[PDB]
Amino acid sequence: DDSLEVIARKLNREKELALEQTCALLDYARLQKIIEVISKAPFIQITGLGGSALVGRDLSFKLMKIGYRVAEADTHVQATVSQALKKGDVQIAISYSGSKKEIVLCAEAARKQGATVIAITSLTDSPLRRLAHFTLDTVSGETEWRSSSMSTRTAQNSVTDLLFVGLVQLNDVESLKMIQRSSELTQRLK
Amino acid sequence: DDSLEVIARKLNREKELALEQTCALLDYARLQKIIEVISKAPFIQITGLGGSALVGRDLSFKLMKIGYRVAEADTHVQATVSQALKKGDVQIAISYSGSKKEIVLCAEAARKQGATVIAITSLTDSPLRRLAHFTLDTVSGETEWRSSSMSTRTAQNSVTDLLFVGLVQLNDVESLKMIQRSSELTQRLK
Amino acid sequence: DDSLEVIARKLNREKELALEQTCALLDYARLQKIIEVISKAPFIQITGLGGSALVGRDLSFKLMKIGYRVAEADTHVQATVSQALKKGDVQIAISYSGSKKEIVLCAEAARKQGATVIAITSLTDSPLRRLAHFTLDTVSGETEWRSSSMSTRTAQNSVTDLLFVGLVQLNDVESLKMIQRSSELTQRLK
Amino acid sequence: DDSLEVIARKLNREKELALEQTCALLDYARLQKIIEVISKAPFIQITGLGGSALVGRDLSFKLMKIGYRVAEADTHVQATVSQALKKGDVQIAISYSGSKKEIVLCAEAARKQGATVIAITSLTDSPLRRLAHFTLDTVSGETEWRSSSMSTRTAQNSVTDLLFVGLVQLNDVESLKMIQRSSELTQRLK
Ligand SMILES: CC(=O)N[C@@H]1[C@@H](O)[C@H](O)[C@@H](COP(=O)(O)O)O[C@H]1O
Ligand SMILES: CC(=O)N[C@@H]1[C@@H](O)[C@H](O)[C@@H](COP(=O)(O)O)O[C@H]1O
Ligand SMILES: CC(=O)N[C@@H]1[C@@H](O)[C@H](O)[C@@H](COP(=O)(O)O)O[C@H]1O
Ligand SMILES: CC(=O)N[C@@H]1[C@@H](O)[C@H](O)[C@@H](COP(=O)(O)O)O[C@H]1O
């Protein structure tokens, strides 16, 4: 039986397991240090391709709203941003495989300029994991072929979402003020 | 206690409940009809803003890969696409509130041209729900303020992901061929 | 003297010469045939990177408004679209160098699927020019280093703009109706 | 006669006149002050919709390459960035009409936060011109209906291109270093 109800139930379980297996790997002490490193960044570049780029943009929209300076989709433009990073800036490199040439190149360029590279990647030995100062692991679990990318994205978002909440915690008043101003402005477009 | 471990556990539960409550509302017979309507569309426009736009782009990348003609982010460009739709085309309008003026306007324009409007929206009585030919419900559950948008996105993706798998089912051989050709091409960029 | 007034005068002359030298190469009989090929395309993909991608998006917004089905920035997504093109579809490949691996790969994939490839590229012997069924030449002229990309873009837009006007000519009534509907809709967002 | 050769000749003249009439309005002393204000900005947001957004992105890619921190297309995201600007940051608001509600709202929000607003807009009395600290004028000239948007874009790019060259002048060594690093990186993707 391959009914839509069976598919929905199986996919929700696949996503639950990706959330569980990804969370199980977290080093929470080290995650807090990563959050503080991001909070001090004068500029943050989030890199990625495909679904990983969308995960990165989803985080970027929230970071922008709460006041971070965040760099877009074009891989060659991304390379130009990476070479312009400076000491204290942060690159968040989102790549499940950790082996996309464009993302590896941007991580190499950012590190060479003295920026801090934080990789969000699968639990595998990749060029990106070898370049990053810190790596946060994303595990999709054993997925069915039709839903591999969706469960991967679920795992990736579980990490970026936690980064966002941790950043809100460090600057709660300003975050609340900026959320309120943002809501007031967009409500004027109704 | 507001430790990162507590936050992660609570957020994963919030997401599990959003998946559960969204799936519980599905009419699976009607979902199959919606999937078949999409499968016959000569052109599909996916509309949305903010996080809903990212959910839509995530679905769009997968639909493009398996051969669908899919329309981008600019709300005024979206309006120009909506007025150019024709009978048989489909608009998938993704808006949790269902009350963003730009999205409502695009749905009105698409319907006027004879296109089919499928809304993906919260369980509320909105202008978008009143304009759509079919509505699929997305329920975030009762969320904490720091994670409301993330659990909403989880619920939205649960619906779009099911649409994707249902579309693969209807054209499995061609979908597999296109996935293979796509993988071969992108591997050449390694 | 490197005053802003001198810079502005020199840049305007550089752009005038790029328009002139690009127009001088046009084969107008062959351009009309290219326009008719585009007008018959059930689906059009416009590929490019960097500034060439922006030139392509500028054309795409206008084509969408007048009713064409047009495919975005992600180079790996572009590859997935190219492999899904069919006989009768058109790829407009915009690349000044004609040697960006991603664009060459997409042109190869489109041609393999039977689609028609129209290259918009510099007057040089490139892999893209060798793959295209038709090539339209864009000449920047001899540019100063600070403005090379701007004069290149001016030349590229001179070709795409002519394609747009030629397409309006072939379907003038429908184009006017769609422009009016588009204007009416966007004015409602004022 | 409405041949493609006649169209091309007329469009090139229309563009030449837009460059001429836009340049004729420049106050070069005030332009130099605007360039210096931009050069000191810790963060620059470029706003716009439609073709104006593409003009802004074209400038943004160049500014990013030479080291500026630059904010994207979503109008509601743009609003969230505008409310997060600070004293010393710059908003470059590109809108020919100067009356798009989204752009006016972002300019109001940026000014309220103490940021400097530079408008690039038509020679008309608009809400945006009334909000901006500095306005640079873009004149399309008297255009034919089929090419109004293209000549407008030509005029807009003439202003942004001059801003870019002026910024290169103020930091020539660093600009050259960053151009070289950028070229070396992207050549590795060949
Ligand atoms: C046809 C294909 O496989 N496209 C893939 C796409 O699915 C994938 O999301 C993207 C990014 O991958 P990553 O997370 O860096 O490992 O890389 C593209 O190449
Ligand atoms: C500052 C704010 O509230 N921005 C919101 C953004 O969070 C939200 O994702 C976007 C779309 O909303 P919808 O799903 O259509 O109800 O609408 C914007 O206005
Ligand atoms: C640092 C650099 O050179 N970036 C370039 C960018 O300027 C250029 O617009 C883009 C596309 O080039 P093309 O028109 O295909 O020859 O390719 C990037 O690599
Ligand atoms: C159907 C239509 O008119 N779309 C327009 C588009 O052509 C235009 O580029 C965009 C921005 O205008 P602006 O430069 O701010 O005056 O505003 C949209 O509404």
**Beta carbon of A103 within 6 Å of any ligand 1 atom:** yes
C115 neighbors C89 (Cβ within 8 angstroms): yes
**Beta carbon of B51 within 6 Å of any ligand 2 atom:** yes
Instruction: Give the 3-state secondary structure of residue B47.
Output: strand
Instruction: Give the 3-state secondary structure of residue A2.
Output: coil
| Amino acid letter for position D178 | M
Total Cβ atoms within 10 A of residue B87:
9
The terminus-to-terminus CA distance of chain A in angstroms comes to 45
| Amino acid letter for position B147 | S
**Nearest ligand for residue B65 CA:** 1
B123/D107 Cα distance (integer angstroms) = 35
For residue D67, which of A74, A113, C7, A73 has the smallest C-alpha distance?
A113
D101/B contact by beta carbon, under 8 A: no
A163/B150 Cα distance (integer angstroms) = 12
C47 neighbors C106 (Cβ within 8 angstroms): yes
D22: left (phi over 0), alpha (psi -120 to 50) or beta: alpha
C159/C163 Cα distance (integer angstroms) = 6
> Which resolution, in Å, applies to this structure?
1.2
D41/B159 Cα distance (integer angstroms) = 43
The terminus-to-terminus CA distance of chain C in angstroms comes to 45
Measure CB to CB from residue A49 to each of C53, C72, C76 and give the nearest one: C76
A154 neighbors B55 (Cβ within 8 angstroms): no
Q: Are strands B134-137 and A116-121 parallel, antiparallel or unpaired?
A: unpaired
DSSP lists the bridge partners of residue B118 as B92, B134
C-alpha pair distances (Å), A84 with each of A77, A101, A113, B21, D122: 11, 19, 7, 46, 33
**Alpha-carbon dihedral C39, C44, C47, C50, rounded to 10 degrees:** 70
D186/D175 Cα distance (integer angstroms) = 16
D44 neighbors D90 (Cβ within 8 angstroms): yes
Task: Please identify, by atom number, the ligand 4 atom nearest to the C-alpha of residue C187.
Answer: 19
DSSP lists the bridge partners of residue D116 as D90
User: How is domain B4-188 classified at the architecture level of CATH?
Assistant: 3-Layer(aba) Sandwich (3.40)
C114 neighbors C86 (Cβ within 8 angstroms): yes
Ligand 2 center from residue B98 Cα (angstroms): 10
Max CA distance (Å), chain C: 56
| Chain D adjacent subunits, 3+ CB pairs under 8 A | A, B, C
Task: Please identify, by atom number, the ligand 2 atom nearest to the C-alpha of residue D77.
Answer: 4
Ligand 4 center from residue A78 Cα (angstroms): 28
D58/C contact by beta carbon, under 8 A: yes
| Residue C73 to residue A73, Cβ atoms within 8 A | yes
What are the extents of the domains in chain D?
4-188
D118/A159 Cα distance (integer angstroms) = 38
D83/D72 Cα distance (integer angstroms) = 14
Which positions ≥6 away from D63 have C-beta within 8 Å?
A: D44, D70, D164, D167
| Technique behind the model | X-ray
Q: State both tokens at B98.
A: 């269902």
For residue A73, which of B73, B84, B189 has the smallest C-alpha distance?
B73
Handedness of CA D41, D42, D48, D52 (dihedral sign): positive
Q: E strands, chain B, where?
A: 44-47, 90-94, 116-121, 134-137
B155 neighbors A157 (Cβ within 8 angstroms): no
Instruction: Give the 3-state secondary structure of residue B69.
Output: coil
Residues constituting chain A: 190
D188/A contact by beta carbon, under 8 A: yes
Measure CB to CB from residue D50 to each of B49, B50, B76 and give the nearest one: B76
B90/B44 Cα distance (integer angstroms) = 5
- Could you tell me what percentage of chain A is helix, strand and coil, using 3-state DSSP and rounding each to the nearest 5? 60, 10, 30
Which residue blocks in A84-134 are alpha helix, DSSP H? 101-112, 127-131
DSSP string, chain D: ---HHHHHHHHHHHHHHHHHHHHHT--HHHHHHHHHHHHT-S-EEEE--HHHHHHHHHHHHHHHHTT--B----HHHHHHHHHT--TT-EEEEE-SSS--HHHHHHHHHHHHTT-EEEEEE-SS--HHHHH-SEEEE----S--GGGHHHHHHHHHHHHHHHHHHHHHHHTHHHHHHHHHHHHHHHHTT-
For residue A154, which of A17, A31, A46 has the smallest C-alpha distance?
A17
Residue in chain A lying closest to D44 (CA): A69
A1/A52 Cα distance (integer angstroms) = 32
DSSP lists the bridge partners of residue C121 as C137
The residue assigned the tokens 């270093």 is D177
Ligand 1 center from residue A48 Cα (angstroms): 9
Total Cβ atoms within 10 A of residue D36:
12
Q: What is the 3-state secondary structure (H, E, C) of chain C?
A: CCCHHHHHHHHHHHHHHHHHHHHHCCCHHHHHHHHHHHHCCCCEEEECCHHHHHHHHHHHHHHHHCCCCECCCCHHHHHHHHHCCCCCCEEEEECCCCCCHHHHHHHHHHHHCCCEEEEEECCCCCHHHHHCCEEEECCCCCCCHHHHHHHHHHHHHHHHHHHHHHHHHHCHHHHHHHHHHHHHHHHCCC
* Cβ contacts of D109 on chain A, cutoff 8 Å: 181, 185
C-alpha pair distances (Å), A154 with each of A140, B4, B6, B95, D114: 8, 18, 19, 20, 39
A122 neighbors A136 (Cβ within 8 angstroms): no
**Nearest ligand for residue C127 CA:** 3
Instruction: Give the 3-state secondary structure of residue A153.
Output: helix
| Residue C80 to residue B182, Cβ atoms within 8 A | yes
C30/B20 Cα distance (integer angstroms) = 59
C93 neighbors C120 (Cβ within 8 angstroms): yes
D56-60: long-range contacts, CB 8 A cutoff, minimum separation 24: D56/D92, D56/D94, D56/D160, D57/C54, D58/C51, D58/C54, D58/C153, D58/D157, D58/D160, D59/D92, D59/D160, D59/D161, D59/D163, D59/D164
DSSP lists the bridge partners of residue B47 as B93
A47 neighbors A103 (Cβ within 8 angstroms): yes
D118 neighbors D136 (Cβ within 8 angstroms): yes
D134/D31 Cα distance (integer angstroms) = 9
D173/A contact by beta carbon, under 8 A: no
B160 neighbors B55 (Cβ within 8 angstroms): yes
| Residue C166 to residue D2, Cβ atoms within 8 A | no
| Amino acid letter for position D23 | C
DSSP A188: T
Ligand 3: list residues with CB < 6 Å: A 76, 80; C 49-52, 95-97, 100, 103, 149; D 182-183, 186
DSSP string, A51-96: HHHHHHHHHHHHHHHTT--B----HHHHHHHHHT--TT-EEEEE-S
A58 neighbors A51 (Cβ within 8 angstroms): no
B62 neighbors B164 (Cβ within 8 angstroms): yes
Q: State both tokens at A149.
A: 């990318």
C185/C189 Cα distance (integer angstroms) = 7
Determine phi and psi for A113, rounding to 5 degrees: -80, 0
Q: State both tokens at A98.
A: 């950790």
For residue B134, which of B90, B176, B175 has the smallest C-alpha distance?
B90
